[PDB]
Write a structure and sequence with these properties.
Chain A: This is V-type sodium ATPase subunit B. The structure is cut from a larger assembly and holds two copies of chain A and one copy of chain B (584 residues). Chain A is α/β, with parallel strands linked by helices. Helix content of chain A is 31%, strand content 21%. The longest helix of chain A has 22 residues. Chain B folds into four domains: 71 residues, no CATH class; 294 residues, no CATH class; 70 residues, no CATH class; 149 residues, no CATH class. Chain B is 34% helix and 22% strand. Chain B is built from 16 helices and 27 strands. Chain B starts with a strand and ends with a helix. Classes of the chains: A alpha/beta (445), B alpha+beta (584).
């Protein structure tokens, strides 16, 4: 057990230890302080008999000569287990709910491995979010990554909560899991999530990794990797279908920048690091299916919609690595539409792989395609009312008007605690489709 | 032979002492895992190595050994219809040898099957004096393509022993006596991927390449040996225009390079290419293709080396006398890989953080394509045609990689998502895309087709550009408030767009349009404008012409679907004339 | 003496130990362990150590078993009258597989600075045969007159055209052409070369061809090679030499890259910050010398930015040059060959190149009011796009039509029609 009283240098959160041997890059370290306190860290650089490490909790209060250093012989690891279901941890996987400490099956490098490109399987089947606005129009596929963009306080977190609550798979789902990763959020929003997961018993099929706004930013960087490590464990080792929700990934980028600034690095645009894109990719590529295995990993990263027109690197960088965009508007949150979903810019580029027979009612694609045009032209009818009231164009456009407001009234309004089955969603859909005459739809049944 | 010792591990950089026997750019195996890396610096006996894989868990005291050579590819039988990663590791063999679904660190695997037997037939008489590029023999590697065994560069002499038979790529199939002694040849040769393969003479790419796609074959053609840049917005059908070019172009092989794509897009590639059918032979297009596959999360070095591996393979098959097409999708990712690696090295940036050498690098790549005379006595002729997707994160075309690409390539195919939004496939922006081959292609097409095809193309575009101008005016004042001539131009432009520019790649006939077919089709479209303008000359009102000629212009719309064996489109011209004469 | 003392290789740079007598900018040869020989240049020299840069890079080199030879001289050009009709690369080594040149002497390619009181004022008129230049923006011997253009807008076509039909009126004293390709593609280079051979112009030309994929460090040497040959033909053989260099934008980029590779201190837009020094040291190498017969005239060709600066800032070039010749894309879409926008085009030296005893005597006056027909010709129609139908139509009726003619025939000569100046003036009057 390597324990060294050879701390040579402390500069901010960084330590230099000399006269060491056998130390490896990105190996974990334990600082044993002069007062009995224990802090943990990670080696960042290693050279001859010297090692530079960063302490997660910082170095305030350390006395160099009278503290010691242990190199643990492994990198950041998740002790994985089937008994993580129902449990709540911190951003480093340490137990947070006062339950028993889990005795792991094994320990996994939270970095994961890169799938062989020919071994990967295309996302091709359907989920039950319970959300008509998406299940129908902006369909989620097992293995997809579909982000959520919304402004602060416009029910975004509630959307997260109910997607996590109602998400399931119709055909013999081995088990539909949710792994929840909170990324640098306040105690109040985190307490919201934990308590909602327990009122409704969603906790019973969920794993939770809670990193808070005042936790170390380096832990904040480690959090999504641990969530996804448990995700891949359950998926491709327990045969389970895993839904992974990460709230305010906007806080991830910031932490990255912070860490990169603390580490004397070369700035990209707006101080963001020169590997920001690559890190986001290392996370987002960890979704999908693997040929010849039952499990799946599906990602919903949840981000705050940027105010500034000029996008920070954060959403553009997310932009092309993802397979869609879901959008919330505060317009609708004030307009009484509880889930503030504008289905106009909403897109799921893999939705065709979710619809169809044996996956849903066969009408799915055709009905969907009439609804998009109908809502857009009904909104056009509603906006047309600008200095051109009821007298202007009172027929055909005006009958669409009514279709556009009642669409919101219940199809989008839903209820943050109403799980609308897919057959429910489409039966309600055809009911809404009846409103306008059969001649508008070039569609044939 | 020499065992170096790690003294420093920092990020993707490793430093190792006792390496004085190695060379700059030598590949080497670092650490106990033997992770692959590149010697980029040397100070005394201490080498600075650029590690290709992740270095987590490595530290000083571990050994380092150089493979004695720079990043290379194996070139021989076993290469066609295979799928590799950026440094030519065979993915399928990777799974079976590792018994794993993942790319583990530090496992080294030959690129070709050194144990599969091949039938080699000799083609040159024992005792004939030869040189680099001379074809010695021949292996029918694949159902469609024949692998011509050629003498490696740096070999000259008299072929001494040559006997046909069944060998592995490791067996001596030939013995040649050189001034430097007696040297044995096999079916495989290796080449460093950042050296361009030697040639005898670079030539002008003046022969147009038949894509079968009317919009580009007519207005924005690329020649055999040319290079095109294709910006690709989301949901613009770029994937199928690349499929169409790969499937219909009159080239011998295709090399497709992944260049760090999202894994799902990449597996779409891996799935759809084998199911694309060669028209000439009906076998899988993969028979005719080499695929390099790289995902966004793979090692950055492999994503940067991907295009060089690809272009080296393309030069290999160009040296055989074949025409090759290298598609890189997308070079934007390749250049982000270049940028990340440059910044990680603490180099002085260039425009938007890309290295200062970005420009040069792109040049070195695209100037390796082209039409060449290969080595060898027969002086055979080959070509590489480059089709590179550029697709910047920022929608702005104005970005260092796109503009640095456009200054060394001559044809630019601008995909437009709002054009795909209007259901216009292929979604090629007709006013902003361009080709500097158009004049030389006119000179060729005119001579072989014995018609004023060049003047026809120039006029079709003339009215299309003029349609842009007129449509702007129409925004200000409605179409009613325009001259009768101008609506006629707009209406023949309608047929240019709908009846010529639009193609459904999935229709059995419309998927490919021949030389003659395109000529006759645009022929009839243009004669409509000619004769109707003579009618306007005669005073007749344009609305009357539209009403009178209703059936025949519907036949002109259905023109794209008349089979290739029959050619009824010519007759249409006469009908037009006669009908407008009835209108008087 | 070969030195077997390479201690460091970092990028394209090499550190050599225990040398003496090595001088800054001295050329070296690396003899590699495998027998290959590469050429290089000393960039720093300090006590017994020297830092050199290898033209072909350092890939494949083994330090311990390679050697360096210090040649004892910098980059030079072997000059001879026999360089006419021949084609070299950016380093003056033959690219045309032709007979070998036995140089009269070797010249440092950096050149000398003319004493200002020894210089002669530009005087004679050069007939480019381009009306748009010869009339409005007249080219004089000893002038530096650049042309700016977007890519593929035929600016290179214009370059080959001036190279083609450029002459002086006496034509008793020959007009030589030195052409420098700076980092252009093989196909662009082939355009220039095969054009030069088909029109026979090669018979009075010396070509220095550096290609887009040649080492940037050689790209830096190319224009100085061209200009050393040019000054040799001008001031030692009495010739009147016209120098065309495309593309100088590529020269700017190669400078930026080299300075980055040498970890120097970045100036504006990361460009080395001695762009004014370098470009002026190139462009001020034109003119006439009192008491000598010949002349040197430069026409640099530049890619115009058309974007967010991030180009070889013209203001620098235009600050050293005596004019600008501007090509825009909108004249190229109209089919106008050559597409010169006469309005921002300027010839700072047209005055005493044109006049009595130098050109026809209407020339000036028609110029000085021929701009005005185009000035108020497009002042109506282009500006009043919205008000176009009726605003300023009854009056100023023909001032549009004549402007259309200025574009359609006066400046749309064609990239292959040689307009004598007097012929040009005849067209000028008929348009009025």
């Amino acid at each position: 057990i390597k324990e060294y009283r050879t701390i040579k240098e402390v500069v901010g959160p960084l330590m230099a230890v000399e006269k060491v041997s056998g130390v490896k890059y990105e190996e974990l370290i334990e600082v044993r302080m002069q007062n009995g306190e224990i802090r943990r860290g990670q080696v960042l650089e290693v050279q001859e008999d010297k090692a530079m490490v960063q302490i997660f909790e910082g170095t305030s209060g350390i006395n160099l000569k009278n503290s010691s250093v242990r190199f643990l012989g492994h990198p950041l690891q998740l002790g994985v287990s089937e008994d993580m279901i129902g449990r709540v941890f911190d951003g480093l996987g340490r137990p947070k709910d006062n339950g028993p400490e889990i005795l792991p099956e094994k320990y996994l490098d939270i970095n994961g491995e890169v799938i062989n490109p020919i071994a990967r399987d295309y996302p091709d089947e359907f989920i039950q979010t319970g959300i008509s606005a998406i299940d129908h129009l902006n369909t989620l596929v097992r293995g997809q990554k579909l982000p959520v963009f919304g402004p602060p306080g416009a029910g975004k977190s509630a959307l997260a909560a109910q997607i996590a609550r109602q998400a399931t798979v119709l055909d013999s789902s081995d088990d539909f899991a949710v792994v929840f990763a909170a990324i640098g959020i306040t105690f109040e929003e985190a307490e919201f999530f934990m308590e909602d997961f327990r009122q409704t018993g969603a906790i019973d099929r969920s794993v939770m990794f809670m990193n808070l706004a005042n936790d170390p930013a380096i832990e904040r960087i480690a959090t999504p990797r641990m969530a996804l490590t448990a995700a891949e464990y359950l998926a491709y080792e327990k045969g389970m279908h895993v839904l992974v929700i990460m709230e305010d990934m906007t806080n991830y980028a910031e932490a990255l920048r912070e860490i990169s600034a603390a580490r004397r690095e070369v700035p990209g645009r707006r101080g963001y690091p020169g590997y920001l894109y690559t890190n986001l990719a290392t996370l987002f590529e960890r979704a999908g299916r693997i040929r010849g295995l039952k499990g799946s990993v599906t990602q919903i990263p949840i981000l705050t919609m940027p105010e500034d027109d000029k996008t920070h690197p954060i959403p553009d960088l997310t932009g092309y690595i993802t397979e869609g965009q879901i959008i919330l508007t505060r317009e609708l949150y004030k307009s009484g539409i509880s889930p503030p979903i504008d289905v106009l810019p909403s897109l799921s580029r893999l939705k065709d792989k979710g619809t169809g027979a044996g996956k849903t009612r066969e009408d799915h694609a055709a009905t969907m395609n009439q609804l998009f045009a109908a809502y857009a032209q009904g909104k056009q009818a509603k906006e047309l009312a600008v200095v051109l009231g009821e007298s202007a164009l009172s027929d055909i456009d005006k009958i669409y008007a009514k279709f556009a407001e009642r669409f919101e009234n219940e199809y989008v309004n839903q209820g943050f605690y109403t799980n609308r089955t897919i057959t429910e969603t489409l039966d309600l859909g055809w009911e809404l489709l009846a409103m306008l005459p059969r001649t508008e739809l070039k569609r044939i049944k | 032979m020499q065992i170096g010792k790690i003294i420093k591990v920092s990020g993707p950089l490793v430093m190792a002492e006792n390496m004085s026997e190695a060379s700059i750019q030598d590949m080497c195996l670092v650490g106990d895992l033997g992770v692959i890396g590149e010697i980029i610096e040397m100070r005394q006996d201490v080498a600075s190595i650029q590690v290709y894989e992740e270095t987590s868990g490595i530290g000083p005291g571990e050994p380092v050994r150089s493979t004695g050579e720079a990043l290379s590819v194996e070139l021989g039988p076993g290469i066609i219809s295979q799928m590799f990663d950026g440094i030519q590791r065979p993915l399928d063999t990777f799974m079976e040898v590792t018994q794993s679904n993942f790319l583990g660190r530090g496992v080294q695997l030959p690129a070709l099957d050194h144990e599969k037997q091949w039938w080699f037939e000799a083609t040159i008489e024992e005792g004939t004096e030869v040189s680099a590029g001379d074809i010695i023999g021949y292996v029918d590697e694949t159902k469609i393509i024949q692998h011509k065994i050629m003498v490696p560069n740096g070999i000259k002499g008299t072929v001494q022993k040559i006997e046909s038979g069944s060998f592995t790529i490791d067996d001596p199939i030939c013995v040649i006596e050189t001034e430097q002694g007696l040297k044995e040849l096999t079916m495989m040769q290796k080449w460093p991927v950042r050296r361009g393969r030697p040639i005898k003479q670079k030539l002008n790419p003046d022969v147009p390449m038949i894509t079968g796609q009317r919009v580009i074959d007519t207005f924005f053609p690329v020649t055999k040996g040319g290079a095109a840049a294709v910006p690709g917005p989301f949901g613009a059908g770029k994937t199928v225009v690349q499929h169409q070019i790969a499937k219909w172009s009159d080239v011998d092989l295709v090399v497709y390079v992944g260049c760090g794509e999202r894994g799902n897009e990449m597996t779409d590639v891996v799935n759809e290419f084998p199911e694309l059918i060669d028209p000439n032979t009906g076998e899988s297009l993969m028979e005719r293709t080499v695929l390099i596959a790289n995902t966004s999360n793979m090692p950055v070095a492999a994503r940067e080396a991907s295009i060089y591996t690809g272009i080296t393979i393309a030069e290999y098959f160009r040296d055989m006398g074949y025409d090759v097409a290298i598609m890189a999708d997308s070079t934007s990712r390749w250049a982000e890989a270049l940028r990340e690696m440059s910044g990680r090295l603490e180099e002085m940036p260039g425009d938007e953080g890309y290295p200062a050498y970005l420009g040069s690098r792109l040049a070195e790549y695209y100037e390796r394509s082209g039409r060449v005379i290969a080595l060898g006595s027969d002086q055979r002729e080959g070509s590489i045609t480059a089709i590179s997707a550029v697709s910047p994160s920022g929608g702005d075309i104005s970005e260092p990689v796109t503009q640095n690409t456009l200054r060394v390539v001559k044809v630019f195919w601008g995909l437009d998502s709002s054009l795909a939004q209007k259901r216009h496939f292929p979604s090629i922006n007709w006013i902003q895309s361009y080709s500097l081959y158009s004049t030389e292609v006119g000179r060729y097409m005119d001579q072989i087709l014995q018609q004023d095809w060049s003047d026809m193309v120039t006029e079709g575009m003339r009215i299309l550009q003029e349609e842009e101008q007129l449509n702007e005016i129409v925004r200000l004042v409605g179409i009613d408030s325009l001259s009768d001539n101008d609506r006629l131009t707009l209406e023949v432009a309608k047929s240019i767009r709908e009846d010529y520019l639009q193609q459904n790649a999935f229709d059995d006939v419309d998927t490919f349009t021949s030389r003659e077919k395109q000529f006759n089709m645009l022929k009839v479209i243009l004669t409509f404008g000619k004769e109707a303008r003579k009618a306007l000359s005669l005073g007749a009102y344009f609305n009357e012409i539209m009403e009178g000629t209703v059936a025949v212009r519907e036949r002109i719309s259905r023109s794209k679907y008349i089979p290739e064996e029959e050619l009824a489109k010519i007759s249409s011209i006469n009908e037009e004339i006669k009908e407008t004469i009835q209108l008087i």
